[PDB]
């Protein structure tokens, strides 16, 4: 189930991701929650 030249190791990958920043999108998180929705095409 593994190549016998490499049996000393183990693989438990699962990614774990990456976290963003301290205070990344605090202002934009408030503007886009109080925003007015207009129709597309109105430039």
């Amino acid at each position: 189930m593994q190549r016998v030249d490499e049996m000393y190791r183990l693989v438990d990958s699962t990614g774990t991701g990456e976290d963003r920043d301290w205070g990344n999108q605090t202002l934009l998180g408030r503007l886009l929650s109080q925003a007015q929705t207009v129709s597309i095409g109105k430039k």
Partner: protein
């Protein structure tokens, strides 16, 4: 992708959540630095630190090395470019560099009833600031105070963030997905030139 359906490694849900983050960080850079590309007649945006709709105020004392007394003495000189020379009112909101939210958690030195920090001292002496928070776009000695809401700094969403899949025709068409978004920003003004946002240094 047909191989990674056998190792059960996702490789798409770990990239549907890595564009959806990166989409909302070059919207955010458009708000904080602006593009000279996108102009219809005269409606540029320019950015929150270079616009002509944003009041520019130069700080005198460095807020990274100053004491507790020079902070409140140079935070009221920022707020008085909204109450005095620009006549605006209402609950103001202030946004803080992450090095400055650090220095606003040290010991006060003025209170002796117990232990209190500078952040609980500012939020009790100047009760006009409704919400104090931090924001990573300020890297060094720079702050920003303004009003949010429909009377001040506001945003208008053209199309909400949606996503779809380009359909596969043949048997060896690669998998592709597209996310798109559309919105715009504007700080409120008045005909003589009275502004509602102040960008500190």
């Amino acid at each position: 992708y047909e191989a990674m359906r056998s190792e059960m490694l996702p490789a798409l849900a770990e990239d549907s959540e890595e564009i959806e983050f990166t989409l909302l960080d070059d919207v955010n850079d458009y708000l904080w630095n602006g593009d000279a590309k996108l102009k219809v007649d005269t409606a540029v945006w320019g950015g929150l630190k270079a616009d002509a709709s944003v009041a520019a105020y130069s700080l005198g004392a460095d807020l990274t090395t100053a004491t507790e007394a020079q902070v409140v003495a140079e935070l009221l000189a920022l707020l008085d470019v909204l109450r005095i020379t620009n006549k605006k009112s209402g609950p103001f909101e202030l946004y803080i560099s992450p090095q400055i939210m650090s220095n606003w958690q040290k010991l006060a030195g003025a209170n002796t009833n117990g232990f209190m920090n500078i952040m609980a001292a500012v939020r009790a002496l100047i009760p006009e600031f409704s919400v104090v928070e931090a924001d990573s776009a300020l890297q060094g000695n720079q702050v920003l105070c303004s009003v949010v809401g429909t009377r001040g700094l506001h945003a208008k969403i053209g199309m909400m963030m949606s996503s779809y899949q380009v359909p596969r025709v043949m048997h060896n068409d690669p998998y592709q997905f597209v996310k798109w978004f559309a919105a715009g920003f504007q700080s409120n003004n008045s005909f003589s030139g009275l502004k509602s946002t102040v960008y500190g240094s």
